[PDB]
């Protein structure tokens, strides 16, 4: 009997940034969906490529856990065949994406009143990222006659910026923690089963 390492992922005190979304392995473990459903109550659930009820007996070879936080109004960005700032300049995925995504809210849990700038996101980048690509560089995106300096303001775009999330803001502006379970049913040994 092996305990799946899902509690820490689903109960992590802190979450990684959008440009540094946490990636975790899931293999060589046994998990039960009934206990998770009984003990976990998510808000938004969306699965492509497999029915929610078919996971009972499916012998998934491996799973990738991608955890991050985004803005509520940007929740539409994460979807197949979608174009946007988050999709292109921060995190790009294949158009024919398959897997599950669970999104929840921590407005009350993370109701840090006063300068809640713990979340940072890349404003823009020179080029468009490819599927399953990431970068943590601080290159200055000048694209103009402005001097090549890291100044935040008009006529000078900083590579990164802090989201203005507050508890009193609108619902669409509230933070959303998203965990994506990506399935790769390739020609590899099966290690996860019920």
């Amino acid at each position: 009997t092996n305990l799946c390492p899902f509690g820490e992922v689903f109960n992590a005190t802190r979450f990684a940034s959008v440009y540094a979304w946490n990636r975790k392995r899931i293999s060589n473990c046994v998990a039960d969906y009934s206990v998770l459903y009984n003990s976990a109550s998510f808000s938004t659930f969306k699965c492509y490529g497999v029915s929610p009820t078919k996971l009972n007996d499916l012998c998934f070879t491996n799973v990738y856990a991608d955890s991050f936080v985004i803005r509520g109004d940007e929740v539409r960005q994460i979807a197949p065949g979608q174009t946007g700032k988050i999709a292109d300049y921060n995190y790009k995925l294949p158009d024919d994406f398959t897997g599950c995504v669970i999104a929840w809210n921590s407005n009350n849990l993370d109701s840090k009143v006063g300068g809640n700038y713990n979340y940072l996101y890349r404003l823009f980048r020179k080029s468009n990222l490819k599927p399953f690509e990431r970068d943590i560089s601080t290159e200055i995106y000048q694209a103009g006659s402005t001097p090549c300096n890291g100044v935040e303001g008009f006529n000078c775009y900083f590579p990164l910026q802090s989201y203005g999330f507050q508890p009193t803001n609108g619902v669409g502006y509230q933070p959303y923690r998203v965990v994506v379970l990506s399935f790769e049913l390739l020609h590899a040994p099966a290690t996860v089963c019920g």
Partner: nanobody
Amino acid sequence: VQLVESGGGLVQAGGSLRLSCAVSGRTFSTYGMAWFRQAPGKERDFVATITRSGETTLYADSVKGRFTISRDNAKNTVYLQMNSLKIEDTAVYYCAVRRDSSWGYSRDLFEYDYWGQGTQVTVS
């Protein structure tokens, strides 16, 4: 192209009505129908929804087990039945067909089209 919601009126205690909601479009397969309660100048409560698989379904904390959800493919008409009325279960009923094409278990209102007219009943 707009959603039709026939019927209405006022129902007192010991009464029943069928909320006939119809979709004008012929792409009923791609509409992830989902329902939610509507209130005047107040938060919108979540309601159960029929799973895309058809055989299965969903349960909502506010209301569950008191709605005769039934998918329709011929005329895209759904008769949302109301039973065991209560103050918690009493509110301005609305048929909000979702234009998105995806599996739906959402609890937020960020992914709905519009709130046009809605319907309700009057209780003395």
